[PDB]
Design an enzyme around this catalytic site. Structure first.
Site, PDB file in Angstrom:
ATOM      1  N   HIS B  41       0.801  -1.221   0.000  1.00 28.61           N
ATOM      2  CA  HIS B  41       0.000   0.000   0.000  1.00 28.61           C
ATOM      3  C   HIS B  41       0.850   1.295   0.000  1.00 28.61           C
ATOM      4  O   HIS B  41       0.314   2.373  -0.200  1.00 28.61           O
ATOM      5  CB  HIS B  41      -1.112  -0.013   1.064  1.00 28.61           C
ATOM      6  N   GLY B 143       2.144   6.241  10.099  1.00 29.23           N
ATOM      7  CA  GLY B 143       3.585   6.046   9.849  1.00 29.23           C
ATOM      8  C   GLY B 143       4.149   4.754  10.421  1.00 29.23           C
ATOM      9  O   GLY B 143       5.344   4.470  10.245  1.00 29.23           O
ATOM     10  N   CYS B 145       3.024   1.647   9.717  1.00 29.21           N
ATOM     11  CA  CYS B 145       2.948   0.551   8.772  1.00 29.21           C
ATOM     12  C   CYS B 145       4.308   0.017   8.388  1.00 29.21           C
ATOM     13  O   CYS B 145       5.270   0.778   8.211  1.00 29.21           O
ATOM     14  CB  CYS B 145       2.141   0.925   7.529  1.00 29.21           C
TER      15      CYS B 145
HETATM   16  C1  LIG Z   1       0.162   2.930   8.346  1.00 28.98           C
HETATM   17  C2  LIG Z   1       0.460   3.573   6.993  1.00 28.98           C
HETATM   18  C3  LIG Z   1       1.722   4.408   7.085  1.00 28.98           C
HETATM   19  O1  LIG Z   1       2.431   4.270   8.065  1.00 28.98           O
HETATM   20  O2  LIG Z   1       2.125   5.358   6.032  1.00 28.98           O
HETATM   21  C4  LIG Z   1       1.130   6.153   5.361  1.00 28.98           C
HETATM   22  C5  LIG Z   1       0.327   5.339   4.350  1.00 28.98           C
HETATM   23  C6  LIG Z   1      -1.276   3.182   8.809  1.00 28.98           C
HETATM   24  C7  LIG Z   1      -1.390   2.781  10.274  1.00 28.98           C
HETATM   25  C8  LIG Z   1      -2.773   2.922  10.865  1.00 28.98           C
HETATM   26  C9  LIG Z   1      -3.290   4.368  10.968  1.00 28.98           C
HETATM   27  C10 LIG Z   1      -3.410   4.733  12.457  1.00 28.98           C
HETATM   28  N1  LIG Z   1      -2.893   3.515  13.077  1.00 28.98           N
HETATM   29  C11 LIG Z   1      -2.646   2.485  12.279  1.00 28.98           C
HETATM   30  O3  LIG Z   1      -2.392   1.337  12.587  1.00 28.98           O
HETATM   31  N2  LIG Z   1      -2.122   2.344   7.936  1.00 28.98           N
HETATM   32  C12 LIG Z   1      -2.988   2.977   7.135  1.00 28.98           C
HETATM   33  O4  LIG Z   1      -3.103   4.207   7.156  1.00 28.98           O
HETATM   34  C13 LIG Z   1      -3.837   2.168   6.195  1.00 28.98           C
HETATM   35  C14 LIG Z   1      -3.480   2.723   4.812  1.00 28.98           C
HETATM   36  C15 LIG Z   1      -3.940   1.950   3.591  1.00 28.98           C
HETATM   37  C16 LIG Z   1      -3.767   2.553   2.329  1.00 28.98           C
HETATM   38  C17 LIG Z   1      -4.161   1.916   1.147  1.00 28.98           C
HETATM   39  C18 LIG Z   1      -4.735   0.657   1.250  1.00 28.98           C
HETATM   40  C19 LIG Z   1      -4.904   0.044   2.501  1.00 28.98           C
HETATM   41  C20 LIG Z   1      -4.514   0.680   3.678  1.00 28.98           C
HETATM   42  N3  LIG Z   1      -5.238   2.492   6.431  1.00 28.98           N
HETATM   43  C21 LIG Z   1      -5.857   2.270   7.603  1.00 28.98           C
HETATM   44  O5  LIG Z   1      -5.318   1.778   8.584  1.00 28.98           O
HETATM   45  C22 LIG Z   1      -7.296   2.717   7.676  1.00 28.98           C
HETATM   46  C23 LIG Z   1      -7.382   3.871   8.695  1.00 28.98           C
HETATM   47  C24 LIG Z   1      -8.810   4.327   8.999  1.00 28.98           C
HETATM   48  C25 LIG Z   1      -9.012   4.477  10.499  1.00 28.98           C
HETATM   49  O6  LIG Z   1      -9.574   3.589  11.146  1.00 28.98           O
HETATM   50  O7  LIG Z   1      -8.521   5.689  11.178  1.00 28.98           O
HETATM   51  C26 LIG Z   1      -9.298   6.873  11.463  1.00 28.98           C
HETATM   52  C27 LIG Z   1      -8.315   8.012  11.740  1.00 28.98           C
HETATM   53  C28 LIG Z   1     -10.189   7.271  10.284  1.00 28.98           C
HETATM   54  C29 LIG Z   1     -10.167   6.630  12.699  1.00 28.98           C
HETATM   55  N4  LIG Z   1      -8.263   1.709   8.111  1.00 28.98           N
HETATM   56  C30 LIG Z   1      -9.157   1.139   7.296  1.00 28.98           C
HETATM   57  O8  LIG Z   1      -9.218   1.390   6.096  1.00 28.98           O
HETATM   58  O9  LIG Z   1     -10.094   0.169   7.868  1.00 28.98           O
HETATM   59  C31 LIG Z   1     -11.269  -0.265   7.170  1.00 28.98           C
HETATM   60  C32 LIG Z   1     -12.404   0.740   7.282  1.00 28.98           C
HETATM   61  C33 LIG Z   1     -12.305   2.007   6.681  1.00 28.98           C
HETATM   62  C34 LIG Z   1     -13.363   2.918   6.786  1.00 28.98           C
HETATM   63  C35 LIG Z   1     -14.525   2.564   7.488  1.00 28.98           C
HETATM   64  C36 LIG Z   1     -14.631   1.300   8.078  1.00 28.98           C
HETATM   65  C37 LIG Z   1     -13.572   0.387   7.971  1.00 28.98           C
END
Ligand SMILES: *[C@@H](CC(=O)OCC)[C@H](C[C@@H]1CCNC1=O)NC(=O)[C@H](Cc1ccccc1)NC(=O)[C@H](CCC(=O)OC(C)(C)C)NC(=O)OCc1ccccc1
Ligand SMILES: *[C@@H](CC(=O)OCC)[C@H](C[C@@H]1CCNC1=O)NC(=O)[C@H](Cc1ccccc1)NC(=O)[C@H](CCC(=O)OC(C)(C)C)NC(=O)OCc1ccccc1
EC number: 3.4.19.12
Lengths: 306, 306
Positions: B41, B143, B145
């Site tokens: 990703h 950050g 990930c």
């Molecule tokens: C690490 C990514 C990184 O370090 O560099 C920038 C890309 C992130 C770590 C997460 C964020 C906070 N704590 C963590 O563990 N990971 C992400 O940002 C991933 C990114 C991604 C991109 C493309 C494809 C797949 C994944 N995304 C998520 O973790 C995302 C975050 C949404 C969330 O829950 O946070 C808030 C702030 C909105 C509350 N989660 C996600 O998509 O879960 C499924 C979902 C989305 C929306 C509604 C219901 C379920």
């Protein structure tokens, strides 16, 4: 999101651990530059343990009475001295893995990471608080003496604890890296006991801020309190008195969440009086007191889940 | 004595962490030999996140689309491929700090240490269990990930987890080091949710053995139970069914304490039905389910405090 008891990465400290033997006693030492630090009780044998005179025991040893192993390599001892409850053994090799470091004496309520070690080899890492009664709730077996406690600021290791002993309640006592004990304890097998402990009030409050930053507000109320009315309740529940210094320390967390300290205090007063009603806070059914305000800032997002 | 959630020393894993950038996205990578592993990703931008086609996004990149930093040093990418939800970037330098290692896919209920990392630099370490619903209760910010999970057997690092995402309940999902997710999750921002979780029964029992080894027997009773009568109660309290395999796994702890598994099961049945009556077990007011039987054997004395 999430909130875990989180230890510092331990790599810089793992590269400093050695094993120190004297007679039939083996324990851990800390190797920085050309000095190895270890508990002086390494020089005791069985019987010595009750009434040892360390000056008298030490003067009877030479440099080659001490065996020091770094991994599979023998370090030769070219010097030795006693500093408080520690020995400082000078060796022929400077540790090539010596990090930037400081020796610090931590204060009650502050936290640190412990690298549990046996026969000079690291076995685990976990986070401890220094209790008000100067003990830690560690996890240590025989052979764990000389294991150290530390914090890391930037790439500098601040060593703050060296493990020396276990007390009858199963909690732990030791020294700073000057060899000065935390608490009224002494390195001999007398009938010493931990004094009564207290809950660390500042930390409980820091942790309530952490719960808010993380999105949870259920425990708050419409009330405020004075420092003094709070402290009357604190005493009744075996909590440390809250001071103005504690209130000021909580400034930045207060600011990030929009909850005034004394308002958080009222919330805490209510939790003590009423309980949690079968609810959790950051997954906990009890009031956690082993995260400092600095721990919360280091782990939580700088942005509140409003 | 004592019992703490204890992570593995993290030094061998710290020497493998790098930062990986693609466009304006930075996250962590794991550098072993001449390969860097990271979540795929990293190649998404904003919008890509909802319906990304990774094969189509990747074919549009060259080797020099990827920036990899090891400390202050740029590693040059000479190759790249996708493996499941991970990228494998071949680089010009073999990591001189590469430990002996394995890639392992852990099973639900098993534990591991997480080295939380940001911009390629380790910030903390803590112990997690893989829940029955294939998520972990971590502590992660933006950050984080590419941060990895691992165990250490002897001097061999068994990597088992790479962090990819957070779910709406604040729990975490990721992959093994083959890039295969734990659970039914996918690396795109759909409406996925953790399934219902269960308490890890085997671990609760292991932890009751730990409490006994450490000297405490208050929760025991004069009763026994059958596997089946136990399981009827288990279901009622959202505990995993106990199996004969679980009973056999508990053999050595049973032997060290003299408490038959099904007798410990009766004790557990009683605790579920009656509560703890305001008492603690290894300092805990709740039934802890994040220590395996192997965790207990690795931390507890081999001698019971009888
Ligand atoms: C690490 C990514 C990184 O370090 O560099 C920038 C890309 C992130 C770590 C997460 C964020 C906070 N704590 C963590 O563990 N990971 C992400 O940002 C991933 C990114 C991604 C991109 C493309 C494809 C797949 C994944 N995304 C998520 O973790 C995302 C975050 C949404 C969330 O829950 O946070 C808030 C702030 C909105 C509350 N989660 C996600 O998509 O879960 C499924 C979902 C989305 C929306 C509604 C219901 C379920
Ligand atoms: C590390 C020493 C080591 O690694 O190498 C061998 C010397 C030990 C770690 C302890 C033991 C288990 N977990 C730990 O944290 N430390 C000690 O063994 C020290 C040794 C010592 C020697 C000479 C002078 C001073 C200290 N001793 C103790 O920790 C001692 C242990 C007694 C205990 O509580 O354990 C059991 C098994 C008997 C339950 N504690 C002690 O003396 O506390 C004061 C006290 C003694 C007796 C009665 C009441 C209080």
């Amino acid at each position: 999101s999430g909130f875990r008891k989180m230890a510092f990465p331990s790599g810089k400290v793992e590269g400093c651990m050695v094993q120190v033997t004297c007679g039939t006693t083996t324990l851990n030492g800390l190797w920085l530059d050309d000095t190895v630090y270890c508990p002086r009780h390494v020089i005791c044998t069985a019987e010595d343990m009750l009434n040892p005179n360390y000056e008298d025991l030490l003067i009877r040893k030479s440099n080659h009475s001490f065996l020091v192993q770094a991994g599979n390599v023998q370090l030769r001892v070219i010097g030795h001295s006693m500093q408080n409850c520690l020995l400082r053994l000078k060796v022929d090799t400077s540790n090539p893995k010596t990090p930037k470091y400081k020796f610090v004496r931590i204060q009650p309520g502050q936290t640190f990471s412990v690298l549990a070690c046996y026969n000079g080899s690291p076995s685990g890492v976990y986070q401890c608080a220094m209790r008000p009664n100067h003990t830690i709730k560690g996890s240590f077996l025989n052979g764990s003496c000389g294991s150290v406690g530390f914090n890391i600021d930037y790439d500098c290791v601040s060593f703050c604890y060296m493990h020396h002993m276990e007390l009858p309640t199963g909690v732990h006592a030791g020294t700073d890296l000057e060899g000065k004990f935390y608490g009224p304890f002494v390195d001999r097998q007398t009938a010493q006991a931990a004094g009564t402990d207290t809950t660390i009030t500042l930390n409980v409050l820091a942790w309530l801020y952490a719960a808010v930053i993380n999105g949870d507000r259920w425990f708050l109320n419409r009330f405020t309190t004075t420092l003094n009315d709070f402290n009357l309740v604190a005493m009744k529940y075996n909590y440390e008195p809250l001071t103005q210094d504690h209130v000021d320390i909580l400034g930045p967390l207060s600011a990030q969440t929009g909850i005034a300290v004394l308002d958080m205090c009222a919330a805490l007063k209510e939790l003590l009086q009423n309980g949690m009603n079968g609810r959790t806070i950051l997954g906990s059914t009890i009031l956690e007191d082993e995260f400092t305000p600095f721990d919360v800032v280091r782990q939580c997002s700088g942005v509140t889940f409003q």
